[PDB]
């Protein structure tokens, strides 16, 4: 019979294909028939070829495959291949979800935390918001002096942690450090330190309390 | 003009699913109530992990339906626990040179895998299949996370001679005062 | 056609509208046939009066007691039946013409003139009345001579005899009667008469005998119908059908095999008789290929003889077949169900949209009950509502309704032990005068109204609640989590910053801990934000006795818990959310008490009251400057609690209130009172006085037990004391003069908590569910909406209970401390919450405006779904709080301050002076 | 007897390939002879088997090719196609270097710039830092006061950048745009365009001038 049929069913199992951006994707719908059915490739159910894609796509008929080189975030959605001839038409819908992976140090907002002044008896709060995809860990450090100066034997500063990132605390309640009823002893250098697999990034601020 | 896409950066606060593939099949990591971890072809409510970091580069993977923790054993077999096992159930995260994540135990050196060829994490020599994960944001609505639905059966007087089928007479619990 | 009804379960699988399920109204279509029926043997009696013949029901109840020689004595009391009909106000009487009385000696013989005279007297008496009669030619009373000579309905020649009898009926009453029914319920005449033997012939041959006798029944019905069609219709213009009967059935599981088994069962029970007369002329194929050698077959002439011999579709959905006489084999292990609406939809789909006519309906009552029945009334009301829903919501051509058994009588296998009558009659009397039952009055009102029209007491009211109204939410299982987020690591670290930021601990140094300012508590801000979203004005939570004072006495105060609660109050006040706290709540592993108290009776010792006084003083001196609406004891259980326990609870509440009044009122200017639970108790029969006083007794046993000492006169309710003295249960403690003076006025605002409504009736009909202690029978109406917890959504109950409280305890400011329902699903169950909250708030507004009560508060229940499961407005899924549509509708009601209608452009309250809140008293 | 040779020697003249990152590559080394030479490869040293790369390698024996998917900068080197036959072997080389790419838009340092006030004819400085691996493509796009709405016919060209791409457009000195002696001639908001072969980062906030 001339009805279309899939040549390899074991090659048609990647229903949801996700890839980091700037990569290449490779769909295929290997079919056969008498005569060989034609292929219509629809982007989200709409006819598509190398017309709206920057860089162009290849639609070679010899292997029944569609390749896309240097994918971009503006390529997400369903992709339906149709093999059709005068004795039958069938379809198979893949899905593409191009991600965006940025493996760098935790980039946190500029100017936050900022220098602050407060009258004794008032309350302050410092803000730091990080932007990194590798689930960064955020803590706050206050610079203190242990015995003499605020500097160790190797030049390394002495700090005490104030609020670390536990598994039982969300990240909404860690981007703000609230000092309520600030006294004179709590006036130094407050550093928001964030770290992921790439490295550490920290921003410092100074709080001064006046009588 | 190519209108700007939504902002990059902050997308890890909330549920994620760990997708992986080997160009033959695609699986999302999924934790079952019976302590079974396996690859679901689709996005299941049992595949909704919530990764939380403790140190800089040491994640813990919870999952919000099974309430388990992704924990490991000495031979590398992934499973789900109920109590924290910090010495064994806390994986060092890493990002490979092509945007793909890997999760290896800091002491067992065995990469978190969905396959059956777990190995040590050499410095970029070759990863086992299903070990190069990729975090995808959750798209399952939270209404389907309340899938546990209180639904018990009544089956009152199952004998075929019932004298009140619609339950109009509904007695109310009390305390009879017998001294 | 067969199979069109197989999707009826599918059409009813999806949840229905959660507002048109119980709040459904609408008059019945004009030209409706409101009817009330009766039988021949059940009601006539006179088994040998005026030389009538012997039925098969006079040789079955006479040594096959509890016979029908004189059941209702209606053979000679022809006047009172029509008098009861006229008083009922009905437009169709459905009686039966007994075969043995009109033709006693034989069909080929002289008809009995006396029986025909009685029937013509009945027809002329109910014709001048204005009631069109409906008659059934055969109501199981086959003459004994035909049972003996030809072998009963088993013979095939007997069918012809039927025609002869029918003929004379068509000759005599054809001018008056316009509806005829050839056979009544042929299932329980072919099966329970000739297969299982439970009824009059009672030979219990075999299933094969039953199938053959059903074949003969169908042939006789076809003969009579064709006689009518060919010889009598063009002169009298009437209709003829066969009074079929069926049940409803539901699958065990929602598969396809179970659904097909349900369809097979329905074909076996009803299609067995309905398909040959309505569709084609042969038995259903789901049963033809199952008992091939058991059931006989029609020839082609017979197939043409049976098809199309029924004008309307008479239906008999009552207790005679549903749940009583259906053989389990015909059920196919599925679930039986008395759902009239789904059955009507199945009939309409299956049998080509016929004119359905419910010619017998209504449940039964236990045989001992007098003219006060309420299970029957509500079952009839539910069935009539189902018929109305099938007419309106699904478009089923229902052309009439017939409540069964105008007056009591035989039950054909249940003797006189079952009452089904709309009119009560005492069989031990001799006059046997028809006394109208409660269901008779209900049917009177339903006919006069012609359905369920929109009542004036359920129309939504437009108007706004007064300014300074206390709109709030409730979460009494507050999630205390006193972990400190910040400033909790005292060690000094060394932070190398060059090849590092892997900071290293340096030993020997541990700094001091910063003062535990209460911003540190992490589990406080999310709750305050969630409350801030819904625009509430009064959050209500409950303190934990077992945590503040774990030991029980004042020697082990846990100051951290008190600090957490003080922060919760301070944060609530800081964001303009005035908090309301409750000192004690009975929802805990041990009565909400410390283990030491809980291991000593926990409410019997007066030392429990003294310890609660000390604990209340401590909580007033700790949280008192932030919280200023105190609730002493939050909704005590008035049922699962003894009387000494209630006495000590009252004493402890008085102690706490006087501790507040004498110590912390001129310094904090708050308010304190108790919060009861006030569900409404409505009499089941709205016109009888016994259940009215029974509802009063139940109310004063539930609400007035713990409220009259506080809000009322001071002593225990007088009805309760009388009831306990009459039963010689002298277990109610007496109030000493000192205690009566102490407790008489320990309140600043009445606080109720309404959830539902329960009907009560004062008739014992099944002592299994009876409440012998109170002599109350607690029922619920089934036309009300029900949450997955089987709790009734009754809007007017709140207004009724508010008016009752104002009438009983004077004019007081009233708070609604808790009012909410639960859900089991997630898709449409929250819509039930939306509807219930909107209607309950509307009823509260009604009670405030046009009743005059001083209601100045409202607290929706279940702030979130983590503390109160299945109840919360904020669902808790995947450790994340998402609002429900109920939250948004509640906020829409709140920020608009009620239901302003079109005039939503006024405030009119600068410097509000409504004297119910914290004022100069 | 004779040494084997190639079938299509015209494709073997390209030892060097300037392939981009995150893109698969194929190495075609066809040959013919009697008998068939072995299909073997090497990587400037030990045997280049499938366990010395992230993602593996594939060997095709039809046209005698070696393919590697999602190339990585660690793949740079000197591969050798060595085809061995009993009658001698044939050597050929490939020098592969990977042009760097980046699977992200130019990471705009959030919070830059701010809403300064150019009151009384003051000066303004605006900041835009992009943390890209390569050197981005950055325009400033000071807005144009036409029609009031910056978005007209779905992205009207209001671009008036004064520092375009070039030697001065890097991640070291073009971070700051300095507008001096600013009178009431620039109100509303500005923008900040950065981009490469993937996408466009474009974000800014309100401005205050007099
Ligand atoms: O066509 C063709 O060719 C092709 O085809 C195909 O392919 C294929 C196939 O498919 C495959 N298969 S599959 O399966 O995949 O599907 C393969 O195959 C074969 C065979 O067959 C097989 O066998 S069978 O039986 O199957 O049959 C085999 O295989 C498989 C595999 O493979 C193996 N391996 S290897 O290495 O060998 O490969 C194995 O495996 C296994 C293993 O193990 C692994 O894997 S691997 O791979 O890695 O190895 C895995 O594993 C794992 C597992 O999983 C685990 N497990 S668990 O559980 O854990 O999970 C483990 O295991 C384990 C176990 O399991 C355990 O146990 S238990 O039980 O527990 O389980 C234990 O523990 O143990 C363990 C162990 O270990 O033991 O682990 C593992 C891992 O391991 S490791 O080592 O890794 O560590 O997996 C496994 C499995 O099983 O799977 O085995 C397998 C089997 O399977 S089964 O199922 O059965 O089982 O073998 C093979 C061989 O051969 O070898 O391959 C093939 C190939 O082919 S050929 O022919 O080539 O030879 C495809 O398609 S389809 O549809 O069919 O599919 C494709 O590929 C195609 O194609 C392509 O190509 C061509 C050519 O190319 S070149 O370059 O050379 O050229 C073409 O193309 C393109 O294009 C074109 C065009 O365009 O046309 C051309 O061109 C031309 O033209 C043009 C034009 O122009 S224009 O202008 O127009 O445009 C021009 O331009 C130019 O110039 C020209 N040129 S030329 O020269 O050509 O002339 C071009 O060029 C081209 O280019 S490219 O570049 O692009 O290519 C076409 O088109 C293409 N296509 S695409 O699209 O793709 O591109
Ligand atoms: Cu990068
Ligand atoms: Zn009653």
Residue numbers in the entry:
A (entry chain C): 150 to 360
B (entry chain B): 25 to 203
C (entry chain A): 34 to 97, 119 to 975
D (entry chain E): 150 to 359
Give the exact sentences the study uses for this entry.
To reveal the molecular mechanism underpinning the coreceptor role of HS, we solved cryo-electron microscopy structures of three distinct 1:2:1:1 FGF23–FGFR–αKlotho–HS quaternary complexes featuring the ‘c’ splice isoforms of FGFR1 (FGFR1c), FGFR3 (FGFR3c) or FGFR4 as the receptor component. Contrary to our prediction, all three cryo-EM structures reveal identical asymmetric 1:2:1:1 FGF23–FGFR–αKlotho–HS quaternary assemblies in which HS enables a 1:1:1 FGF23–FGFR–αKlotho ternary complex to recruit a lone FGFR chain (termed FGFRS to differentiate it from the ‘primary’ receptor FGFRP within the ternary complex). At the membrane distal end of each quaternary complex, HS engages in tripartite interactions with juxtaposed HS binding sites of FGF23, FGFRP and FGFRS. In doing so, HS augments interactions of FGF23 and FGFRP from the FGF23–FGFRP–αKlotho ternary complex with the FGFRS chain, and thus induces receptor (that is, FGFRP–FGFRS) dimerization.
The direct FGFRP–FGFRS contacts bury a modest solvent-exposed surface area (1542.6 Å2) and are preserved among the three cryo-EM structures. Akin to the FGFRP–FGFRS interface, the FGF23–FGFRS interface is also conserved among the three quaternary complexes and masks a rather modest surface exposed area (1668.6 Å2). Notably, in all three cryo-EM structures, electron densities for the FGF23 N terminus are poorly defined, which implies that the FGF23 N terminus engages FGFRS D3 in a rather degenerate and flexible fashion. We targeted site 2 of the FGFRP–FGFRS interface in each of the three quaternary complexes by introducing four different point mutations individually into full-length FGFR1c (E249A, R254A, I256A, Y280A), FGFR3c (E247A, R252A, I254A, Y278A) or FGFR4 (E243A, R248A, I250A, Y274A). As in the case of the L6-FGFR1cWT cell line, cotreatment with FGF23 and soluble αKlotho of L6-FGFR3cWT and L6-FGFR4WT cell lines robustly stimulated FGFR signalling as detected by phosphorylation/activation of FGFRs and downstream PLCγ1/FRS2α/ERK signal transducers. In contrast, cells expressing mutated FGFR1c, FGFR3c and FGFR4 had diminished FGFR A-loop tyrosine phosphorylation and reduced PLCγ1, FRS2α and MAPK activation. It is unlikely that the impaired signalling by FGFR1cI256A and FGFR4I250A is solely due to reduced cell-surface expression because the glycosylation and cell-surface expression of the corresponding FGFR3cI254A is unaffected.
